[PDB]
Design an enzyme around this catalytic site. Structure first.
Site, PDB file in Angstrom:
ATOM      1  N   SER A 178     -45.352  61.334  20.000  1.00  0.00           N
ATOM      2  CA  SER A 178     -44.038  61.260  19.282  1.00  0.00           C
ATOM      3  C   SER A 178     -44.075  60.131  18.506  1.00  0.00           C
ATOM      4  O   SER A 178     -44.432  58.911  18.964  1.00  0.00           O
ATOM      5  CB  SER A 178     -42.844  61.449  19.931  1.00  0.00           C
ATOM      6  N   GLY A 179     -43.508  60.030  17.397  1.00  0.00           N
ATOM      7  CA  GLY A 179     -43.472  58.731  16.454  1.00  0.00           C
ATOM      8  C   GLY A 179     -44.796  58.211  15.868  1.00  0.00           C
ATOM      9  O   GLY A 179     -44.671  57.246  15.158  1.00  0.00           O
ATOM     10  N   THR A 183     -44.858  64.650  11.456  1.00  0.00           N
ATOM     11  CA  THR A 183     -43.954  65.380  10.445  1.00  0.00           C
ATOM     12  C   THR A 183     -44.430  64.647   9.177  1.00  0.00           C
ATOM     13  O   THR A 183     -44.406  65.350   8.004  1.00  0.00           O
ATOM     14  CB  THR A 183     -42.680  65.045  10.754  1.00  0.00           C
ATOM     15  N   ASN A 225     -38.191  57.850  19.160  1.00  0.00           N
ATOM     16  CA  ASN A 225     -38.645  57.766  17.599  1.00  0.00           C
ATOM     17  C   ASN A 225     -37.017  57.895  17.216  1.00  0.00           C
ATOM     18  O   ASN A 225     -36.373  58.736  17.673  1.00  0.00           O
ATOM     19  CB  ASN A 225     -39.538  58.573  17.174  1.00  0.00           C
ATOM     20  N   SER A 228     -37.466  61.826  15.649  1.00  0.00           N
ATOM     21  CA  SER A 228     -38.317  62.665  16.102  1.00  0.00           C
ATOM     22  C   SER A 228     -37.981  64.189  16.411  1.00  0.00           C
ATOM     23  O   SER A 228     -36.470  64.461  16.623  1.00  0.00           O
ATOM     24  CB  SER A 228     -38.397  62.295  17.617  1.00  0.00           C
ATOM     25  N   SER A 229     -38.667  65.091  15.767  1.00  0.00           N
ATOM     26  CA  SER A 229     -37.965  66.416  15.691  1.00  0.00           C
ATOM     27  C   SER A 229     -37.975  67.224  17.154  1.00  0.00           C
ATOM     28  O   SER A 229     -38.705  66.613  17.866  1.00  0.00           O
ATOM     29  CB  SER A 229     -38.850  67.317  14.575  1.00  0.00           C
ATOM     30  N   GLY A 451     -44.496  66.327  19.076  1.00  0.00           N
ATOM     31  CA  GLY A 451     -44.960  65.063  19.725  1.00  0.00           C
ATOM     32  C   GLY A 451     -44.639  64.939  21.231  1.00  0.00           C
ATOM     33  O   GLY A 451     -43.828  65.662  21.724  1.00  0.00           O
ATOM     34  N   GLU A 453     -43.693  63.393  24.686  1.00  0.00           N
ATOM     35  CA  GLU A 453     -42.369  62.489  24.669  1.00  0.00           C
ATOM     36  C   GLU A 453     -42.406  61.937  26.328  1.00  0.00           C
ATOM     37  O   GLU A 453     -42.108  63.034  27.135  1.00  0.00           O
ATOM     38  CB  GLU A 453     -41.115  62.780  24.171  1.00  0.00           C
TER      39      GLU A 453
HETATM   40  N1  LIG Z   1     -48.239  56.494   8.188  1.00  0.00           N
HETATM   41  C1  LIG Z   1     -47.033  56.385   8.071  1.00  0.00           C
HETATM   42  N2  LIG Z   1     -46.458  55.566   6.825  1.00  0.00           N
HETATM   43  C2  LIG Z   1     -45.079  55.433   7.035  1.00  0.00           C
HETATM   44  N3  LIG Z   1     -44.310  55.580   7.938  1.00  0.00           N
HETATM   45  C3  LIG Z   1     -44.840  56.102   9.151  1.00  0.00           C
HETATM   46  C4  LIG Z   1     -46.087  56.697   9.207  1.00  0.00           C
HETATM   47  N4  LIG Z   1     -46.259  57.092  10.505  1.00  0.00           N
HETATM   48  C5  LIG Z   1     -45.084  57.031  11.127  1.00  0.00           C
HETATM   49  N5  LIG Z   1     -44.228  56.512  10.272  1.00  0.00           N
HETATM   50  C6  LIG Z   1     -42.742  56.370  10.689  1.00  0.00           C
HETATM   51  O1  LIG Z   1     -42.441  56.777  12.205  1.00  0.00           O
HETATM   52  C7  LIG Z   1     -41.470  57.414  12.204  1.00  0.00           C
HETATM   53  C8  LIG Z   1     -41.796  58.758  12.829  1.00  0.00           C
HETATM   54  O2  LIG Z   1     -42.689  59.585  11.770  1.00  0.00           O
HETATM   55  P1  LIG Z   1     -42.809  61.382  12.035  1.00  0.00           P
HETATM   56  O3  LIG Z   1     -43.611  61.742  11.013  1.00  0.00           O
HETATM   57  O4  LIG Z   1     -41.448  61.751  12.143  1.00  0.00           O
HETATM   58  O5  LIG Z   1     -43.494  61.397  13.346  1.00  0.00           O
HETATM   59  P2  LIG Z   1     -42.899  62.008  14.599  1.00  0.00           P
HETATM   60  O6  LIG Z   1     -42.672  63.459  14.190  1.00  0.00           O
HETATM   61  O7  LIG Z   1     -44.060  62.120  15.816  1.00  0.00           O
HETATM   62  O8  LIG Z   1     -41.783  61.137  15.204  1.00  0.00           O
HETATM   63  C9  LIG Z   1     -40.769  57.784  10.944  1.00  0.00           C
HETATM   64  O9  LIG Z   1     -39.691  56.723  10.768  1.00  0.00           O
HETATM   65  C10 LIG Z   1     -41.853  57.351  10.020  1.00  0.00           C
HETATM   66  O10 LIG Z   1     -41.424  57.009   8.745  1.00  0.00           O
HETATM   67 MG   LIG Z   2     -41.934  64.989  13.975  1.00  0.00          MG
END
Ligand SMILES: Nc1ncnc2c1ncn2[C@@H]1O[C@H](COP(=O)(O)OP(=O)(O)O)[C@@H](O)[C@H]1O
Ligand SMILES: [Mg+2]
Ligand SMILES: CC(C)n1c(=O)cc(N[C@@H](C)c2ccccc2)[nH]c1=O
Lengths: 900, 34
Positions: A178-179, A183, A225, A228-229, A451, A453
């Site tokens: 996660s994070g 997504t 996060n 986090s979805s 993710g 978690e």
């Molecule tokens: N490659 C990346 N570039 C910019 N921001 C990112 C990147 N990877 C993660 N983040 C940031 O980290 C957080 C989680 O991203 P997300 O895609 O929702 O992953 P998850 O679904 O695992 O939380 C968000 O705030 C996102 O903006």
């Molecule tokens: Mg996600």
């Protein structure tokens, strides 16, 4: 170079410069002296050997420490040419730290992406880097993995290329903790296909927005996060034969419905709640008639409700725009916000026990009539149904009085089940748009199913989310190490199967099997007399000492009321068993849902129309459908890696990343991509495709065996004969030979086909500019006739000219001939096209309908067997609980009689 | 496969549970005799 300018300002974040490569060659370096050494605070560090001491080493570190190291703990620095390489398979000396420092020097220069052979590993930048600019996507168009710098866009292009070449469905399987960016990477892969189809739109936009609209309901800021979805998602992107975008299909596995009414400290309820409360639009705030302060609504307000990083005023604006583009009608969008609002008010209903009947009556009638007003019930029959639910006894219903605690729990369950159904309906409406009704031949499935978690407090959906990812990584294990390696032995290649040891199927079977945790929670929740404590007893009894992944908890941080811990692939996750059975069954007061069915609100009826099949079982069957749907595709995996707990961008904590690469098995993916054979082509498809390399080896017209011809052709290329192998129906290449044959094919084709293309550009330009000459000629006769038109109307004689000619014979006969020829031509074409289509399509339809009825009979056989099994299990489990109680009393009676 | 393995494990568990009640009811009868 000159060509990297197409990557624009992102270029410093994609490729080490040529000036940096020469600088690296200026660096003092020695293959005999430069080595990595392991350390605590950084998993590995750069060092230089100072002495060799037999089976012992000493070396001094870049930050000045000195340590004695053993040979298996010391491993070569690759020479500066290979450091920071684009593809880890090209590494000279393969080990974990070369992976780490390829990552750390790339990410240190905010080059986040690297490959690990056939696929990508991504370490997360909390900074928004330019590596996702839509003009950087075009730089990946057709730029094959050996040419392009590593990126997720390379994997998307590779999946579109294997789609068009093999004529087979593909997939892109985004994974990680996660994070990490699953997504956002999914939003980027979807952005890839959207903008690729955008140069060559309604579905294009809809697939991008299908993420944030589902996020705002799906997602909540957690300790791990800010975004986090809380639901698994599987997309199929469908492409037509011409390779353009055709359709998409969103399948969602389980919403974390429990969150809607309960949040721990430091975590929010779902973002839709606060963004409607924290609002720029007063009309949303008053149509719900909710207070602007979040704190007074008990269910959403607990935990934490303001966050350091989210402009909820804009996240509300964003969700509003996402439903606008997805085409949810205003009445639907408002109704679903009304339902969210009612779930907020529903916790504010206060109930009081009667002085002697132990029955709940409302004191807080203002909150109950606020709720009923929103859900379109009546205050009195809602309150009567909640406090006095109707249950059936024979053909007549009987009324039961509820306790204040159990009416509170029932109002919670109503809040959850209205929310969860509202989410799945929103997905079903997304799947009802996202359909331009175009004929479909290939799909690419992009997956972001969870993710991993750890919170301090994990519940039913924290089991569901961690399990659902667990299966996706075991799918990685099976595809890269089982499916790929078995094919070599099946084709009869002189290959020795190597065991990578990466298997977790014991833990998925630990959950999925009819003896797993989710199987227990579904078999237990049927019994009305079950309770969480005996669920805990049976759950522990069935798995403790019988599963390698199931172990007793330590509870070092206290709280040993009812705990268990499960070591999902990426680490520890501890779980709190409290409330799980009610969450799995989700029993709704049938009078109250019958009143919901009866609601004035068309949505709430549609949600509850047509209200054994637990939430566990339904999620399970969706995820099993997922894997069966996915095995019919060619997958590319994406490993997203979180760098650091604290969201510090550009910072990169070695222990967390290296542990993630360990759990994602990426180094094994390097080993198998370097040692194995990444690409194989059917003898007919390749012989015909690349015969161009030596047409004298495969002359046309003359008979040629594909296997024997392929043997002659490859012997004629003079390439290292150890870089290829011969299979029964597929040719086998190493990655060096594959890349060399790929480039030789591209060059031989380039010399022939660029001449052919020069001719094609000749005909395209000639014909189009001739059309521009024709349209110029039409422009010329337009301006000439406009000059005639002015000359005529300013001419006084026009009175005769204009009126008489429509009356005269030309309008009587030339128009008649024009209509006659128009009708006869349209008659001929329409008749032939419709007869063709009907004759072909009716026989196709009847063939598919017959196959539909055959499989229907198969389904009938299934439902017969499952019904038999259901009645067998129901009678066995009911008699077990009866006899089990009988033996408990028998034993206690015999203990009493022995005590006498 | 799920339904068949579920029934199969319910029957096996019932077999062991029957052995349990066999020993229990026997010992209860022995206590009644003593
Ligand atoms: N490659 C990346 N570039 C910019 N921001 C990112 C990147 N990877 C993660 N983040 C940031 O980290 C957080 C989680 O991203 P997300 O895609 O929702 O992953 P998850 O679904 O695992 O939380 C968000 O705030 C996102 O903006
Ligand atoms: Mg996600
Ligand atoms: C079996 C699998 C690993 N595989 C291959 O081994 C080779 C594939 N495709 C070849 C035909 C190709 C090469 C270059 C561009 C497009 C397609 N596809 C594949 O799916």
């Amino acid at each position: 170079d000159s060509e990297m300018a197409v990557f624009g300002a992102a270029a410093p974040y994609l490729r080490k410069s040529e000036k940096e490569r020469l600088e690296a060659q200026t660096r003092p370096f020695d293959l005999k002296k430069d080595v990595f050494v392991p350390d605590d605070k950084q998993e590995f560090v750069k060092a230089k050997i100072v002495s060799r001491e037999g089976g012992k080493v000493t070396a001094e570190t870049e930050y000045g420490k000195t340590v004695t190291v053993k040979e298996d703990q010391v491993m070569q620095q690759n020479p500066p040419k290979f450091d920071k390489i684009e593809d880890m398979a090209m590494l000279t000396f393969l080990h974990e730290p070369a992976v780490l420092y390829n990552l750390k020097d790339r990410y240190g220069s905010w080059m986040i992406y690297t490959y690990s052979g056939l696929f990508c590993v991504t370490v997360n930048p909390y900074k928004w880097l330019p590596v996702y600019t839509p003009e950087v996507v075009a730089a990946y168009r057709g730029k094959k993995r050996s040419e392009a710098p590593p990126h997720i866009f390379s994997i998307s292009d590779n999946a579109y290329q294997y789609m068009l070449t093999d004529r087979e469905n593909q997939s892109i399987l985004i994974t990680g903790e996660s994070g990490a960016g699953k997504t956002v990477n999914t939003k980027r892969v979807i952005q890839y296909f959207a903008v690729i189809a955008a140069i060559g739109g309604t579905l294009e936009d809809q697939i991008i927005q299908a993420n944030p609209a589902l996020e705002a309901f799906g997602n909540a800021k957690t300790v791990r996060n800010d975004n986090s979805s809380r639901f698994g998602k599987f997309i199929r992107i469908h492409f037509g034969a011409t390779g353009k975008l055709a359709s998409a299909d969103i399948e969602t596995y389980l919403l974390e419905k429990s969150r809607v009414i309960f949040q721990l400290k430091a975590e929010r309820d779902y973002h839709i709640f606060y963004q409607i409360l924290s609002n720029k639009k007063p009309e949303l705030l008053d149509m719900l008639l909710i207070t602007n302060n979040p704190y007074d609504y008990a269910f959403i307000s607990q935990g934490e409700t303001t966050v350091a990083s989210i402009d909820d005023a804009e996240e509300l604006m964003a969700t509003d725009n996402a439903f606008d583009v997805l085409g949810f009608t205003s009445e639907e969008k408002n109704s679903m916000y009304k339902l969210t609002g009612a779930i907020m008010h529903f916790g504010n209903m206060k109930f009081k026990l009667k002085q002697r009947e132990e029955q709940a009556e409302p004191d807080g009638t203002e909150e109950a009539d606020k709720s009923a007003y929103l859900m379109g019930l009546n205050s009195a029959d809602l309150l009567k149904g909640l406090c006095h639910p109707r249950v059936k006894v024979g053909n007549e219903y009987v009324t039961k009085g509820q306790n204040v605690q159990q009416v509170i729990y029932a109002t919670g369950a109503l809040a959850k089940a209205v929310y969860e159904r509202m989410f799945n309906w929103m997905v079903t409406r997304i799947n009802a748009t996202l359909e331009t009704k175009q004929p479909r031949q290939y799909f690419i499935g992009v997956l972001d199913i969870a993710g991993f978690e750890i919170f301090d407090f994990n519940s039913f959906e924290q089991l569901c989310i961690n399990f659902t990812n667990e299966k996706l990584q075991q799918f990685f294990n099976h595809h890269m190490f089982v499916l790929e390696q078995e094919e070599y032995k099946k084709e009869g290649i002189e290959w020795t199967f190597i065991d990578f040891g990466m298997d977790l199927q014991a833990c998925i079977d630990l959950i999925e099997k009819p003896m797993g945790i989710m199987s227990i929670l579904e078999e237990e929740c049927m019994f009305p007399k079950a309770t969480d404590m005996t669920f805990k007893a049976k759950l522990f009894d069935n798995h403790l000492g019988k599963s390698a992944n199931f172990q007793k908890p330590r509870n070092i941080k206290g709280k040993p009321e009812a705990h268990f811990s499960l070591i999902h692939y990426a680490g520890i996750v501890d779980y709190n068993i409290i409330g799980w059975l009610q969450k799995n069954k989700d029993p709704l007061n049938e009078t109250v849902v019958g009143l919901y069915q009866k609601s004035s609100l068309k949505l709430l009826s549609t949600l509850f129309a047509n209200y054994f099949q637990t939430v566990s079982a339904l999620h399970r069957e969706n995820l099993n459908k997922l894997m069966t749907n996915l095995r019919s595709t060619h997958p590319h995996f994406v490993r997203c890696i979180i760098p650091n707990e604290t969201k510090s961008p550009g910072v990169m904590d070695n222990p967390l990343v290296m542990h993630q690469l360990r759990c994602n098995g990426v180094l094994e993916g390097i080993r198998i991509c370097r040692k194995g054979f990444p690409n194989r082509i059917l003898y007919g498809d390749f012989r015909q495709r690349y015969r161009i390399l030596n047409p004298a080896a495969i002359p046309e017209g003359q008979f040629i065996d594909s296997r024997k011809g392929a043997e002659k052709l490859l012997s004629s290329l003079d390439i290292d004969h150890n870089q290829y192998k011969f299979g029964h129906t597929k040719v086998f290449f190493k990655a060096g030979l594959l890349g060399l044959l790929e480039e030789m094919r591209d060059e031989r084709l380039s010399r022939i086909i660029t001449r052919i293309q020069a001719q094609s550009r000749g005909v395209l330009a000639r014909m189009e500019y001739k059309k521009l000459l024709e349209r110029r000629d039409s422009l010329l006769v337009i301006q000439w006739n406009i000059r005639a038109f002015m000359g005529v109307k300013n001419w006084p004689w026009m009175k005769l000219y204009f009126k008489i000619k429509p009356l005269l014979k030309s309008a009587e006969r030339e128009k008649e001939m024009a209509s006659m020829k128009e009708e006869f031509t349209r008659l001929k074409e329409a008749l032939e096209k419709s007869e063709a289509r009907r004759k072909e399509l009716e026989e196709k339809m009847v063939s598919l309908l017959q196959e539909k009825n055959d499989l229907q009979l198969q389904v009938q056989a299934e439902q017969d067997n499952l019904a038999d099994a259901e009645e067998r299990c129901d009678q066995l489990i009911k008699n077990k609980i009866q006899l089990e109680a009988k033996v408990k009393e028998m034993n206690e009676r015999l203990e009493d009689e022995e005590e006498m």
